[PDB]
């Protein structure tokens, strides 16, 4: 998001057998202003503060 | 002041006074007033715990103030 | 209440009927400090086989998986009152299963409260701090002089709770937390149980220094059993009683047969000379009366210490420790080689827990007790 909601979607295929989507969704912190993605489940988003990085992996 | 170090910041340059030499930028003083500081773990541990219990805590204030304008509605 | 008219108020107050006619129910429902949008059309009729339920982007997330059972229980459930109680129940196991997922920590009580501690305590203690804040690690000096450190693990309420304490000393430790208790409390509980033990590390420490410790090499601070060498090719291994550690501890022999009666013979017969005011090293070289090498030298000294069979030392935890009854052999296998051997060939005869057989090497006969 812009406000800084991000949201996250994985398969799953757990405890019943048939493929369900697990959703998150963060907050993290800024007015986000761009993003892009690093290979091995990492995202460099920014901040007007910060370049700031998460780890999915 | 300018990002002479190539870090990621801003610092600021200070050239002393020329009664000390007939020399250009010599007598430099290179800070960021955080940490970067040139010139010519007790304490520093728990900063970024706090910076992101700052973060955290804005973040739940912004949370809140999206709740309570729903239930305004 | 019995009725659904007051019932369904006090079992969810936060629905609150739009339409005049009881068809529109609009609000929140609350789970463990949570209040979830909510809108529930009904038909005409008081009926659940068909309704209409929307939700927020929020609830739809948490209600993720669980779409079926929600959809057959409206199917199932007879009244709207107990639709909403199911439905509650349903979104709190949801939540209890996604506590990976909604976990905070208030920044009033908590940050500050843990930094008066952590002062309150000392900065020359504090070791390492996580930046979530969760963890932290202590670290504490014996009278001896050694470093014992401690893991607290802090929930979103840490004064509230007892904190998640990990410790490495192998008697179990037991931390009394009151809500009035903090770190400072269990850190002197900590430094009690450390000069408790302090005898049992004393030990521990005399023997690592004096002898060449085999099989816990680099041993952790937990590790209470030191399978010592001496001589050549043969290993005593000792467990030690953390509460009486200078009294006698559990010993036997490990390799030659002919080489070992001696020991076993010379221990039995002298063990009453065994006094528990010496060291367990002092008490040993008096009761077995024979010395030890200090690292005569202990990476190679002169012998292929491999299997024999497999060429290697480190399968799978095991050590080569079952040896020939040989001067000309004297070869060490392990156990799972040796075994693995000597129940192929013909010649092997297997008692209870025994197998006697050919070595090898020197065809000689050699026992294993499994
Ligand atoms: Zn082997
Ligand atoms: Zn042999």
Redesign the pocket.
């Given at each position: 998001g812009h406000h800084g909601r991000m949201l996250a979607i994985k398969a799953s295929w757990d405890e019943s057998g048939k493929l369900v989507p697990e959703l998150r969704e963060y907050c993290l912190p800024g007015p986000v202003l761009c993003a892009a993605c690093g290979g091995g489940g990492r995202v460099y988003h920014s901040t007007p503060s910060d370049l700031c990085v998460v780890d999915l992996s | 002041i300018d990002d002479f170090i190539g870090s990621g910041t801003e610092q600021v340059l200070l050239l002393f006074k020329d009664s000390l030499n007939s020399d250009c930028l010599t007598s430099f003083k290179i800070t960021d007033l955080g940490k970067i500081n040139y010139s010519s773990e007790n304490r520093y541990l728990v900063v970024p715990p706090l910076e992101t219990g700052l973060k955290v805590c804005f973040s739940s204030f912004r949370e809140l103030r999206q709740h309570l304008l729903l239930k305004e509605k | 209440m019995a009725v659904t008219e007051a019932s369904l108020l006090r079992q969810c107050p936060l629905l609150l009927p739009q339409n005049r006619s009881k068809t529109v129910y609009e609000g929140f429902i609350s789970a463990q400090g949570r209040d979830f949008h909510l809108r529930i059309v009904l038909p005409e009729d008081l009926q659940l086989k068909n309704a209409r339920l929307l939700c927020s982007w929020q609830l739809r997330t948490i209600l993720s998986g669980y779409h079926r059972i929600v959809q057959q229980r409206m199917q199932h459930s007879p009244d709207l009152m107990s639709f909403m109680m199911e439905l509650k129940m349903l979104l709190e196991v949801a939540l209890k299963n996604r506590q990976e997922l909604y976990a905070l920590p208030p920044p009033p009580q908590f940050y500050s409260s843990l930094i008066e501690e952590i002062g309150t305590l000392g900065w020359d203690k504090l070791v390492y701090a996580d930046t979530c804040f969760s963890t932290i690690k202590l670290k504490a000096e014996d009278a001896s002089g050694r470093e014992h450190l401690i893991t607290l693990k802090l929930k979103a309420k840490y004064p509230a709770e007892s904190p998640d304490y990990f410790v490495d000393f192998p008697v179990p430790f037991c931390a009394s937390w009151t809500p009035q208790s903090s770190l400072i409390s269990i850190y002197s509980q900590f430094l009690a149980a450390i000069e408790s033990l302090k005898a049992f590390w004393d030990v521990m420490d005399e023997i690592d220094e004096k002898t060449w410790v085999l099989e816990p090499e680099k041993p952790p601070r937990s590790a209470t059993a030191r399978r010592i060498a001496l001589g050549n090719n043969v290993s005593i291994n000792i467990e030690v009683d953390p509460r009486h550690p200078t009294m006698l501890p559990e010993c036997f022999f490990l390799g030659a047969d002919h080489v070992v009666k001696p020991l076993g013979i010379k221990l039995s017969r002298n063990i009453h000379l065994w006094d528990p005011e010496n060291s367990v090293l002092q008490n040993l070289k008096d009761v077995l009366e024979i010395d030890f090498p200090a690292r005569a030298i202990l990476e190679k000294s002169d012998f292929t210490m491999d299997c024999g069979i497999c060429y290697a030392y480190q399968l799978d935890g095991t050590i080569p420790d079952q040896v020939?009854d040989?001067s000309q052999?004297g070869?060490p296998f392990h156990q799972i080689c040796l075994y693995e051997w000597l129940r192929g060939l013909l010649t092997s005869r297997q008692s209870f827990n025994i197998i006697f057989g050919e070595?090898p090497?020197?065809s000689?006969p050699?026992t294993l007790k499994m």
């Open positions: - | - | 020939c040989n052999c070869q070595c090497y020197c000689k050699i």
